[PDB]
């Protein structure tokens, strides 16, 4: 079997980068819409007995892209592909990973079941919002970390990183922030927005010392940037000299760009798990860490039957 | 269909309390071992068209108890029970909820699959180590909270609770601690044991102020009590006046009892999701919050087709 | 794909013998218990695209070992093994193969379903208590016979084997005894313990002539040795000169060792599907037929895509 | 839900007897063949929310009848029946219950899987050739015994039954014969046809004493009657005064009728799990035990959610 | 893996032709009936790791043949075949492809489910009665067309084919007839038998002009030939000079041979998806298009991982 890399409509630049790093051309696919807005998928080459990797991030037109991915997976399976792997850099519906409300769906589990029934044999993803999403499948799920790339960026772009403090913008980010602070041998802090019992002012509590130090906000994603912007205001109010925000998934939906442009961030750093070209044109603060080499190495090692553990300590 | 409550060998006192609160006698079951240590299950009454609830905590002889539960579920299903619900107050293998190591099993997902294939239609559990374990099943999973009972105990047993600080013993407990601190309108702190890069001394970092205040350690479980004991030493070293530990699952395996007896805890508070009678005989610091009323109300509402949302704000 | 042989905690000497006969080292696995007695499995090498064989007998801590086997199977499957085969020399819960009582579980079927959901693709076992257990799976199940090794032992160790009579200790062993008697061209007899209608003395009926002849008791297993010991008393009372007992699974649980030491057996012969080192130290009558060559040949032929029919007529 | 009894083409007289004992009319079904010999099933009434019981024995045109049963089960399921139960008095392919030959199918398991995928929720059958066939399903399987009816017939029709010996025609029938002999408090014997190593004369070995006593051959089925006829010749050669044959499934295929007419049987007794009207017209020795009351009681108790254990000790 | 071609009892001449075109001998299989008319399948060689193709048409003893095919598929799967493909030239129960009546089964879906549960990994068939039957499976289904062979026969055997009109015998054949007429650049007509509201005379309506032209009836199958015979009478009554009938599946059950012999057909042309040797002996009008080369090429390309699209434009 040979590696066949197919791109959905979501992140075709990332698919191209992965294919170039693998020394391959992208597989021939026409991914369009019928007139009635139904997804049209036209695989333009044989995938018989091939090791098919479909790159599709959960971003942009989320349901459009997920349906595109499912249809492409099913087409490859019925076309007798040896193995179909869904490379989903940003897993859609990952934040709907539990039922903590009455009648609430576990949409991440539904997406996992849909991918399984479409015929996916393997999932490659980066920085799942909850790592337990790996357990939502009965197939192997690669949950790659952007943490080595984040550490590289911090050590190369922040002069006073050895005296910095890594800040969690919410309680759920504590593990990620503590891991990064341990790897950098720096202090960490946590910011919590307390629960909205009524319609008074949202107030943020900070635990840890950030006074007269550079604060690096690290989180898994910035959708509306309410979390990171509120954390940034709190950090400046607490005496932080400079505030950075580093995310792996830059969704930047809704008012995020205006929020960041009016915030105090020295830089907002995201990976290219989601296309950022449009976002960077309206926000100069955004910088992008390319993770295409990580995904390409993961695909290559999956095809060659080699461990991907190397990707959790080094940036290829 | 009628409620049939069956007890495994793990926590029969809790099963009795649930049955009494439901105004029922426990179903007739003989749960023993064959000579070769294979689990022997002898259901002593018809469950045809009945709503069967099997109470079995993940504690004691873990694999023995889980096999007992699976065999009882399968026997009830083949005996044409209308519905089989596994009441698992402490979910076994819940800490193995992700693959963050090479070749690591997701044992929680395997346990969920085993329960599903045994024929469970419903799971009732308390304070899952990861709430995403709800997504490991395709059946409804009730993840009950001991938090209302914990808040009741704090308000009734700690005189200075309004000036206390709720402390997370690790980074993963941050959400639970922030929720409790919000409900009590008190400060919170977090304690992190940094990663063991080599064989030097384990050192703990505390973020937040606990000086001259009562510190309440809140966590989901205390297995060996290394986490809570190390956190307690750190809290006293940081100037805490008194230190409490409140858990929902008191496993207290291995050296936990000696650790607690030699620690500085004012009280170690656990629920009775795991039997504590033996533990209390060797550690006077342990106190037990009865959660049998919560489980009984959950079972009764499940049988009657009523919401269990009331259990997340009140202790019945 | 390459053969990877992994040992559970149950029978590691047999796993070592199989690996030596295959010219391989055992795969690196740490199979221990967490403090709370949950099974801990740490596969120490890649199994990507490998043909994994996990050796785990149903013996000793039965539920412990079965959970170990299931966790190891699931870990290998999620670790992208090409194929996972469970080598289970003595199938656990094999005697619970039917529902002939109200509410009785079919525990063998539950174990088969658990192995299937863990991800086993192939089962290799020896002398299933019921051969229909092969039908409990939807995957191929190799039910190897110890009969050629038993015939070899009889012809090499019993001088008057041509005038012996092979005796079934119960009605269920009749097929095995008739097959062995046909292969040896000798007489056979059957012993039946009639059903316990009340609390009077257990009485045994013998059909067939054993007077002044060597009697060989052949059965699939000896758990408590009540069956073989009662049959031995009956055979001596019926005029048998010498009495042998040949089993394939020597469980020897409970009072079996004292029963055998106080019985009249010339020799109790078992295979090493279950470890016998401890049993032989307390009972000199026990002798062991090594079947590691049969299992090793079965594994080798399974890997090479060759028939295992040769194993049913010859001992390699 | 109401009981709906539907008859296949196999045994419509038995279906009528069951319906009369249940005080019901048979459900309206047209079960014919299309011109190209495809099975045509036309259910003539609504089964929405009904408790559907389909009576179809494995006899006559075996594959025709099994396909008829599967199509009727699937039609009832798609027609929104509350529950579909397959009443299969003689389970087809039951003798293909294991893989003891290279490349041999387990046809009983395939039939079970086909019934499961057709949508059967419950199986009611009589005297499975192997009771482990219950484990071939994941649904409840009722394996009713004709033994109480057989004991009733023996006590009412054989004057010297207290001095009789119950004879197994092969090694596999030993459990059934020992159970019957225990219930009658009589002796038992076993007859074995040794394996055909070459083309010499088939010779039968008898263990047990039948001289000058009435011999009752008891087996689960008589297909070609080679087993019972050879056993009858052996029993007469051994000095039996009279020889009876009692089966639960009278298949009587091929040369069975001529074999019985030329045999020495006092009577050949079968149940009506298979239609016997044609067989009795050509063989006066055949007598029929009606088991329609057992099946009707089983269906009624299944519908009413009552235990069928009463059917294993009494004939209703 | 190597191609292994196994023949069922249905169409062994076609299997032989396929094997010869593949340069192979048919796999050793004994496909007979037990005495009680149960299907007996004895695969006479190893299929371990082999690419197994089982040829079995839906014809003759339909349920017999389908059960034979299912048993052979399951035997090959349990015998550890690498892949099992069911080559079903005429799909049985294909006309039962929808539920347009109360309580009607979808027998085609049931057959698909039975093939899936037997373990088929791939289906190769010719001219499905409904192409949507491909969607009844979750495995790849090759729906080969006899249309190129039909066009070849028309261009080589009908001198005035350029002035002919291709006639649909019913409304459902319109797509097939329009496709053929487009490929031949000829006119088309449609014949409809209006619905039987009462017991008056069946009357046929013809849309299109067939006067003084050769009419070619093209349909997917001729079971009883009522459709084609009635269409032929209508076509002659409408002024057609000569009438041909071309089918891909010649079932010719029941009165079809007498109907054709008394009809006005110049020739009745069928493929050999169903054996026609017996039919041709009683009807000189029947001619056979060999499609064994199409099936052999499909099998060869499936084994070699090559597209079968070439088969839809050319006859190999
Ligand atoms: N795509 C989404 N965008 C915004 N909010 C979401 C989205 N999906 C889910 N949510 C909401 O956010 C919740 C998850 O919140 P999160 O901050 O991820 O962690 P936690 O629920 O543990 O506090 C969900 O329960 C739901 O109410
Ligand atoms: N150091 C690590 N940190 C986090 N996750 C890891 C780590 N090592 C492995 N994993 C997880 O395990 C998966 C597979 O691990 P890997 O080492 O590539 O080999 P194997 O597939 O045999 O386990 C990765 O995709 C990742 O999800
Ligand atoms: N029963 C157990 N007892 C002790 N350690 C366990 C147990 N089950 C799993 N573990 C280990 O603990 C890890 C889980 O650690 P935990 O403190 O729950 O959270 P995190 O892994 O997110 O830091 C597992 O990956 C495994 O290495
Ligand atoms: N306030 C809450 N906090 C956390 N989990 C909740 C809450 N309300 C509901 N749940 C979860 O939802 C499950 C079922 O919710 P419930 O309100 O009883 O009704 P429904 O089953 O219709 O959703 C509970 O068992 C629990 O797991
Ligand atoms: N591990 C076990 N040890 C002892 N008895 C067992 C065990 N498992 C099941 N049993 C009991 O033994 C019965 C099986 O008996 P056995 O001698 O194997 O054959 P039979 O039931 O056909 O007479 C089961 O139905 C159950 O009552
Ligand atoms: N002579 C035999 N006696 C009993 N079982 C047998 C015999 N031959 C084969 N089997 C069964 O069939 C299985 C597989 O058979 P084998 O001859 O190795 O080839 P295949 O897998 O192609 O059938 C064996 O593992 C065993 O369970
Ligand atoms: N319908 C049938 N009619 C005749 N023989 C059959 C039938 N089905 C299977 N067989 C054969 O008989 C064998 C089963 O033999 P049986 O007497 O029931 O018990 P055992 O195989 O345990 O000696 C099968 O393995 C097969 O070879
Ligand atoms: N005495 C018995 N002998 C044999 N099989 C029995 C006996 N009692 C029950 N069974 C089996 O168990 C099945 C169901 O048992 P039953 O007593 O009716 O209640 P339940 O379904 O709750 O187990 C029966 O259909 C039969 O297969
Ligand atoms: N093997 C068969 N032989 C004859 N008629 C059949 C067969 N299978 C199904 N039928 C009947 O024919 C119907 C299908 O008719 P057909 O001419 O194929 O198309 P349509 O139903 O779309 O008009 C089925 O609904 C059923 O009533
Ligand atoms: N021109 C066509 N007309 C009709 N069906 C087609 C055509 N091309 C392909 N198919 C269908 O697609 C199946 C597989 O197509 P093929 O071109 O062989 O490659 P792939 O399997 O990769 O799709 C065929 O078996 C057939 O059912
Ligand atoms: O749009 P925002 O909610 O600010 O950003 C997404 C956040 O929501 C979730 O907690 C994620 O972990 C992030 O912290
Ligand atoms: O025995 P210990 O590890 O101290 O207690 C169990 C802890 O391990 C996990 O993090 C749980 O969340 C607890 O904090
Ligand atoms: O401990 P024991 O019951 O004596 O030995 C196990 C027996 O139980 C079952 O019948 C097995 O076939 C053996 O004959
Ligand atoms: O036609 P026959 O083989 O004589 O009768 C069927 C027999 O085959 C099987 O062993 C059944 O248990 C019966 O004893
Ligand atoms: O026996 P006949 O019904 O005439 O031939 C079979 C027909 O029935 C279905 O419509 C097929 O498409 C054919 O047109
Ligand atoms: Mg979250
Ligand atoms: Mg967050
Ligand atoms: Mg954890
Ligand atoms: Mg923790
Ligand atoms: Mg048994
Ligand atoms: Mg026995
Ligand atoms: Mg048998
Ligand atoms: Mg028999
Ligand atoms: Mg149609
Ligand atoms: Mg038609």
């Amino acid at each position: 079997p040979n590696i066949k890399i197919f791109s959905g409509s979501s992140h075709q630049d990332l698919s191209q980068k992965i294919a170039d790093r693998l020394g391959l051309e992208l597989g021939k696919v026409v991914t369009k819409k019928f007139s009635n807005q139904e997804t049209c998928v036209e695989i333009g080459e044989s995938v018989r007995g091939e090791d098919v990797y479909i790159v599709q991030s959960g971003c942009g037109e989320i349901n459009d892209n997920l349906m595109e991915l499912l249809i492409m997976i099913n087409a490859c399976k019925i076309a007798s592909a040896s193995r179909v792997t869904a490379v989903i850099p940003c897993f859609p519906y990952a934040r709907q990973d539990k039922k903590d409300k009455s009648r609430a769906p576990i949409s991440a589990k539904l997406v996992a079941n849909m991918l399984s029934v479409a015929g996916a044999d393997h999932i490659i993803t980066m920085d799942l919002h909850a790592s337990q999403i790996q357990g939502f499948f009965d197939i192997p799920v690669d949950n790659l970390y952007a943490e080595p790339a984040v550490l590289k960026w911090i050590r190369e772009n922040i002069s006073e990183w050895r005296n910095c403090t890594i800040v969690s913008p919410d309680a759920g980010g504590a593990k990620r922030v503590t891991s990064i602070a341990d790897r950098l041998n720096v202090d960490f802090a946590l910011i919590h927005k307390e629960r909205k019992k009524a319609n008074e002012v949202d107030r943020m509590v900070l635990v840890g010392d950030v006074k007269d130090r550079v604060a690096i906000l690290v989180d898994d994603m910035a959708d509306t940037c309410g979390t990171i912007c509120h954390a940034a205001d709190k950090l400046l109010s607490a005496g932080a000299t400079r505030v950075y925000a580093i995310l792996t998934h830059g969704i930047f939906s809704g008012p995020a760009i205006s929020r960041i442009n009016n915030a105090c961030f020295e830089a907002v750093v995201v990976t290219n798990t989601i296309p950022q070209e449009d976002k960077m044109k309206h926000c100069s603060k955004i910088q992008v860490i390319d993770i295409s080499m990580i995904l390409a190495e993961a695909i290559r090692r999956t095809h060659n039957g080699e461990s991907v553990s190397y990707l959790f300590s080094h940036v290829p």
Side-chain angles (χ1 to χ4, degrees), chain A residues 34-48:
Chain A
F34 288 117
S35 187
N36 80 321
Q37 293 329 83
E38 258 162 40
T39 294
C40 178
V41 165
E42 286 165 11
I43 302 185
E45 57 179 354
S46 182
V47 300
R48 254 167 212 274

Side-chain angles (χ1 to χ4, degrees), chain A residues 125-140:
Chain A
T125 189
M126 180 158 293
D127 278 311
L128 284 164
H129 172 77
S131 46
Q132 294 84 7
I133 287 170
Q134 290 178 290
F136 288 7
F137 301 80
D138 286 46
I139 52 170

Side-chain angles (χ1 to χ4, degrees), chain A residues 165-169 188-191 204-218 227-245 264-265:
Chain A
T165 167
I166 315 297
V167 189
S168 177
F188 78 97
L190 185 123
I191 281 170
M204 317 260 287
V205 52
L206 162 77
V207 284
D209 172 81
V210 300
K211 209 216 166 330
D212 311 321
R213 313 153 77 53
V214 169
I216 303 172
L217 281 165
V218 172
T227 314
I228 52 156
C229 285
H230 291 163
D233 308 289
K234 182 57 175 168
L235 283 174
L236 281 209
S237 138
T241 53
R242 297 203 315 294
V243 177
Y244 294 80
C264 46
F265 289 115

Side-chain angles (χ1 to χ4, degrees), chain A residues 162-230:
Chain A
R162 310 162 184 278
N163 312 298
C164 85
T165 167
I166 315 297
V167 189
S168 177
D170 53 19
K175 178 186 173 183
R176 184 181 308 274
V177 201
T178 49
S179 159
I180 278 186
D182 287 39
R183 291 249 155 61
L184 290 171
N185 192 24
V186 290
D187 295 295
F188 78 97
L190 185 123
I191 281 170
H192 173 70
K193 185 169 68 69
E194 47 209 23
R195 196 171 344 188
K196 201 56 151 61
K197 62 180 180 295
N199 328 311
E200 65 303 302
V201 199
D202 274 328
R203 98 170 251 258
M204 317 260 287
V205 52
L206 162 77
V207 284
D209 172 81
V210 300
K211 209 216 166 330
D212 311 321
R213 313 153 77 53
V214 169
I216 303 172
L217 281 165
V218 172
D219 212 343
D220 67 304
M221 69 168 71
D223 187 354
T224 63
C225 296
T227 314
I228 52 156
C229 285
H230 291 163

Side-chain angles (χ1 to χ4, degrees), chain A residues 238-311:
Chain A
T241 53
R242 297 203 315 294
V243 177
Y244 294 80
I246 300 170
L247 305 308
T248 165
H249 307 297
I251 303 170
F252 299 132
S253 70
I257 293 313
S258 87
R259 258 168 199 174
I260 293 175
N261 283 339
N262 302 321
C264 46
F265 289 115
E266 190 68 38
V268 175
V269 188
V270 299
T271 78
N272 60 340
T273 57
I274 289 149
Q276 303 299 335
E277 288 90 287
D278 201 75
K279 295 330 194 310
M280 309 221 352
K281 271 194 298 257
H282 309 307
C283 177
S284 85
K285 281 155 168 218
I286 298 178
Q287 299 171 335
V288 167
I289 293 170
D290 182 20
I291 49 91
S292 69
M293 77 291 314
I294 306 172
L295 288 176
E297 192 56 12
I299 289 160
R300 156 177 188 220
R301 289 170 177 275
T302 302
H303 177 75
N304 292 331
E306 322 172 280
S307 189
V308 307
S309 177
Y310 158 90
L311 292 173

